[PDB]
Design an enzyme around this catalytic site. Structure first.
Site, PDB file in Angstrom:
ATOM      1  N   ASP A  20      55.978  11.739  16.532  1.00  0.00           N
ATOM      2  CA  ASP A  20      57.175  12.543  16.767  1.00  0.00           C
ATOM      3  C   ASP A  20      56.844  14.027  16.628  1.00  0.00           C
ATOM      4  O   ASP A  20      57.606  14.806  16.048  1.00  0.00           O
ATOM      5  CB  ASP A  20      58.284  12.131  15.797  1.00  0.00           C
ATOM      6  CG  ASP A  20      59.651  12.685  16.179  1.00  0.00           C
ATOM      7  OD1 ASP A  20      60.575  12.569  15.340  1.00  0.00           O
ATOM      8  OD2 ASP A  20      59.800  13.250  17.291  1.00  0.00           O
ATOM      9  N   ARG A  39      60.439  21.157  16.646  1.00  0.00           N
ATOM     10  CA  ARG A  39      61.406  20.953  15.568  1.00  0.00           C
ATOM     11  C   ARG A  39      60.771  20.327  14.330  1.00  0.00           C
ATOM     12  O   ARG A  39      61.341  20.426  13.236  1.00  0.00           O
ATOM     13  CB  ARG A  39      62.560  20.068  16.039  1.00  0.00           C
ATOM     14  CG  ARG A  39      62.142  18.640  16.336  1.00  0.00           C
ATOM     15  CD  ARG A  39      63.306  17.785  16.857  1.00  0.00           C
ATOM     16  NE  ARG A  39      62.816  16.490  17.336  1.00  0.00           N
ATOM     17  CZ  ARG A  39      62.404  16.246  18.583  1.00  0.00           C
ATOM     18  NH1 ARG A  39      62.437  17.199  19.513  1.00  0.00           N
ATOM     19  NH2 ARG A  39      61.961  15.036  18.906  1.00  0.00           N
ATOM     20  N   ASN A  40      59.626  19.660  14.475  1.00  0.00           N
ATOM     21  CA  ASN A  40      58.956  19.046  13.337  1.00  0.00           C
ATOM     22  C   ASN A  40      57.787  19.867  12.824  1.00  0.00           C
ATOM     23  O   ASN A  40      56.909  19.330  12.151  1.00  0.00           O
ATOM     24  CB  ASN A  40      58.513  17.622  13.680  1.00  0.00           C
ATOM     25  CG  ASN A  40      59.675  16.666  13.684  1.00  0.00           C
ATOM     26  OD1 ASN A  40      60.650  16.881  12.960  1.00  0.00           O
ATOM     27  ND2 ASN A  40      59.598  15.617  14.500  1.00  0.00           N
ATOM     28  N   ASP A  61      57.128  15.088   8.929  1.00  0.00           N
ATOM     29  CA  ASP A  61      57.732  13.877   9.494  1.00  0.00           C
ATOM     30  C   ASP A  61      56.756  13.061  10.340  1.00  0.00           C
ATOM     31  O   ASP A  61      57.159  12.385  11.291  1.00  0.00           O
ATOM     32  CB  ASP A  61      58.983  14.213  10.316  1.00  0.00           C
ATOM     33  CG  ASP A  61      60.160  14.581   9.444  1.00  0.00           C
ATOM     34  OD1 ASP A  61      60.029  14.478   8.210  1.00  0.00           O
ATOM     35  OD2 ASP A  61      61.217  14.965   9.991  1.00  0.00           O
TER      36      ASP A  61
HETATM   37  C1  LIG Z   1      64.078  22.760  14.001  1.00  0.00           C
HETATM   38  C2  LIG Z   1      64.663  21.578  13.268  1.00  0.00           C
HETATM   39  C3  LIG Z   1      65.292  21.881  11.918  1.00  0.00           C
HETATM   40  O1  LIG Z   1      66.128  22.708  11.783  1.00  0.00           O
HETATM   41  N1  LIG Z   1      64.831  21.096  10.800  1.00  0.00           N
HETATM   42  C4  LIG Z   1      65.325  21.173   9.438  1.00  0.00           C
HETATM   43  C5  LIG Z   1      66.633  21.523   9.127  1.00  0.00           C
HETATM   44  C6  LIG Z   1      67.057  21.543   7.804  1.00  0.00           C
HETATM   45  C7  LIG Z   1      66.174  21.193   6.787  1.00  0.00           C
HETATM   46  C8  LIG Z   1      64.876  20.838   7.121  1.00  0.00           C
HETATM   47  N2  LIG Z   1      63.914  20.460   6.107  1.00  0.00           N
HETATM   48  C9  LIG Z   1      63.279  21.512   5.368  1.00  0.00           C
HETATM   49  N3  LIG Z   1      63.734  22.743   5.438  1.00  0.00           N
HETATM   50  C10 LIG Z   1      63.171  23.715   4.754  1.00  0.00           C
HETATM   51  N4  LIG Z   1      63.644  25.085   4.823  1.00  0.00           N
HETATM   52  C11 LIG Z   1      64.810  25.600   5.531  1.00  0.00           C
HETATM   53  C12 LIG Z   1      65.102  26.957   5.431  1.00  0.00           C
HETATM   54  C13 LIG Z   1      66.199  27.497   6.089  1.00  0.00           C
HETATM   55  C14 LIG Z   1      67.008  26.675   6.854  1.00  0.00           C
HETATM   56  O2  LIG Z   1      68.134  27.175   7.523  1.00  0.00           O
HETATM   57  C15 LIG Z   1      67.958  28.335   8.281  1.00  0.00           C
HETATM   58  C16 LIG Z   1      69.262  28.577   9.047  1.00  0.00           C
HETATM   59  O3  LIG Z   1      70.338  28.523   8.156  1.00  0.00           O
HETATM   60  C17 LIG Z   1      70.877  29.780   7.869  1.00  0.00           C
HETATM   61  C18 LIG Z   1      66.720  25.323   6.951  1.00  0.00           C
HETATM   62  C19 LIG Z   1      65.626  24.785   6.297  1.00  0.00           C
HETATM   63  N5  LIG Z   1      62.131  23.463   3.963  1.00  0.00           N
HETATM   64  C20 LIG Z   1      61.618  22.258   3.837  1.00  0.00           C
HETATM   65  C21 LIG Z   1      62.211  21.231   4.552  1.00  0.00           C
HETATM   66  F1  LIG Z   1      61.747  19.957   4.490  1.00  0.00           F
HETATM   67  C22 LIG Z   1      64.453  20.811   8.432  1.00  0.00           C
HETATM   68  O1  LIG Z   2      60.394  13.644   2.815  1.00  0.00           O
HETATM   69  C1  LIG Z   2      60.334  14.072   3.914  1.00  0.00           C
HETATM   70  N1  LIG Z   2      60.957  15.319   4.280  1.00  0.00           N
HETATM   71  C2  LIG Z   2      61.663  16.112   3.312  1.00  0.00           C
HETATM   72  N2  LIG Z   2      62.437  17.210   3.642  1.00  0.00           N
HETATM   73  C3  LIG Z   2      63.000  17.830   2.434  1.00  0.00           C
HETATM   74  C4  LIG Z   2      62.581  17.116   1.282  1.00  0.00           C
HETATM   75  S1  LIG Z   2      61.640  15.888   1.699  1.00  0.00           S
HETATM   76  C5  LIG Z   2      59.579  13.292   4.965  1.00  0.00           C
HETATM   77  C6  LIG Z   2      58.121  13.736   4.955  1.00  0.00           C
HETATM   78  C7  LIG Z   2      57.687  14.644   4.004  1.00  0.00           C
HETATM   79  C8  LIG Z   2      56.358  15.046   4.001  1.00  0.00           C
HETATM   80  C9  LIG Z   2      55.471  14.533   4.938  1.00  0.00           C
HETATM   81  C10 LIG Z   2      55.907  13.625   5.887  1.00  0.00           C
HETATM   82  C11 LIG Z   2      57.234  13.233   5.898  1.00  0.00           C
HETATM   83  N3  LIG Z   2      59.711  11.908   4.574  1.00  0.00           N
HETATM   84  C12 LIG Z   2      58.881  11.162   3.653  1.00  0.00           C
HETATM   85  C13 LIG Z   2      59.446   9.729   3.572  1.00  0.00           C
HETATM   86  C14 LIG Z   2      59.026   8.601   2.840  1.00  0.00           C
HETATM   87  C15 LIG Z   2      59.735   7.408   2.949  1.00  0.00           C
HETATM   88  C16 LIG Z   2      60.853   7.338   3.785  1.00  0.00           C
HETATM   89  C17 LIG Z   2      61.271   8.453   4.512  1.00  0.00           C
HETATM   90  C18 LIG Z   2      60.558   9.658   4.400  1.00  0.00           C
HETATM   91  C19 LIG Z   2      60.755  11.042   5.055  1.00  0.00           C
HETATM   92  O2  LIG Z   2      61.598  11.367   5.822  1.00  0.00           O
END
Ligand SMILES: *CCC(=O)Nc1cccc(Nc2nc(Nc3ccc(OCCOC)cc3)ncc2F)c1
Ligand SMILES: O=C(Nc1nccs1)[C@@H](c1ccccc1)N1Cc2ccccc2C1=O
Ligand SMILES: [Cl-]
Length: 266
Positions: A136, A140-141, A154
């Site tokens: 994936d 966006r990822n 992801d």
């Molecule tokens: C492009 C796809 C997308 O937006 N993915 C997304 C959205 C929300 C949360 C995550 N996971 C994630 N996010 C952050 N940091 C972050 C910082 C600022 C954000 O908002 C900016 C606009 O709002 C004003 C959103 C997310 N850090 C670690 C994460 F796993 C991914």
């Molecule tokens: O945790 C992740 N993303 C985060 N965003 C904010 C806090 S955590 C993401 C991830 C993290 C790191 C590497 C790959 C995938 N996971 C893990 C995982 C383990 C088991 C089941 C689902 C997931 C999942 O979505």
């Protein structure tokens, strides 16, 4: 190994603000307060929607995602298991790369774009070295820790417009199918976040690919850059470049960025 994934107690973290919510679950900005320490660490917390079943599969995969060790791959820091699964990793303050290039479309030069291509290729190469198939990869990822430090997230979790033809038709996913998605991801960056095949239904994508059509050349891309993207979308998966070759090619171009991308005010 086992000590790479922290099993967290509800005391050890607090959700402070909502970052986003969707079908997947909810992501929060929060604090990690490890027990026995005197620090509060800003983190991102993702709470998955409750699962009906089992829970072991989520934990098994979490151990794998905690074991990655590469500057361009997000690592899972901790997990909290209750009625729901809650996942903790480092906050990426600038959000996803797709939104970042859209929001800064007028302030991004060729050096930034090519460095991102290098970094994403390095992370993908690392995942391939670990025998992990992403499945994936899209702009966006990719998350933005700082403007010149991005990380893939992801991996190992239907995105028709990013999938290689063999994935659409035969449900076949390999490192070479990831290369196809890499090519689409690079196209997103070079168009500053345009939607691939915009306004075309996902159900028609297989036929237009079968017809030999591909994403168009971005205006900023010279032919050398576009040819690389095009090779990622060859029907024969073995004929696509390998991530090791992409690192070398994009690293070479990042040494002379203005030669390979034509951007106004660069
Ligand atoms: C492009 C796809 C997308 O937006 N993915 C997304 C959205 C929300 C949360 C995550 N996971 C994630 N996010 C952050 N940091 C972050 C910082 C600022 C954000 O908002 C900016 C606009 O709002 C004003 C959103 C997310 N850090 C670690 C994460 F796993 C991914
Ligand atoms: O945790 C992740 N993303 C985060 N965003 C904010 C806090 S955590 C993401 C991830 C993290 C790191 C590497 C790959 C995938 N996971 C893990 C995982 C383990 C088991 C089941 C689902 C997931 C999942 O979505
Ligand atoms: Cl979008």
């Amino acid at each position: 190994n086992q000590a790479l994934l922290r099993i967290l107690k509800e005391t050890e973290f607090k959700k402070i603000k909502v970052l986003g919510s969707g079908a997947f679950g909810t992501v929060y900005k929060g604090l990690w307060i490890p027990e026995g320490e005197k620090v509060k660490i800003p983190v991102a917390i993702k709470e998955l929607r409750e699962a009906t079943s089992a829970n072991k599969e989520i934990l098994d995969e979490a151990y794998v995602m905690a074991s990655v060790d590469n500057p361009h791959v997000c690592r899972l820091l901790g997990i909290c298991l209750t009625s729901t699964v809650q996942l903790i990793m480092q906050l990426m303050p600038f959000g996803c790369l797709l939104d970042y290039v859209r929001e800064h479309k007028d302030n991004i030069g060729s050096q930034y774009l090519l460095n991102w291509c290098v970094q994403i290729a390095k992370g993908m190469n690392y995942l391939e070295d670990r025998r992990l198939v992403h499945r994936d990869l899209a702009a966006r990822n990719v998350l933005v820790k700082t403007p010149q430090h991005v990380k893939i997230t992801d991996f190992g979790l239907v995105p028709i417009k990013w999938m290689a033809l063999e994935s659409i038709l035969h449900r076949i996913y390999t490192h070479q199918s990831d290369v196809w998605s890499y090519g689409v991801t690079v196209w997103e960056l070079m168009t500053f976040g345009s939607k691939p095949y915009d306004g075309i239904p996902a159900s028609e994508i297989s036929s237009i690919l079968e017809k030999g059509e591909r994403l168009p050349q971005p205006p900023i891309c010279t032919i050398d850059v576009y040819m690389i993207m095009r090779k990622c979308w060859m029907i024969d998966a073995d004929s696509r470049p390998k991530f090791r070759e992409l690192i070398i090619e994009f690293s070479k171009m990042a040494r002379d960025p203005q030669r390979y991308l034509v951007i106004q005010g660069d």
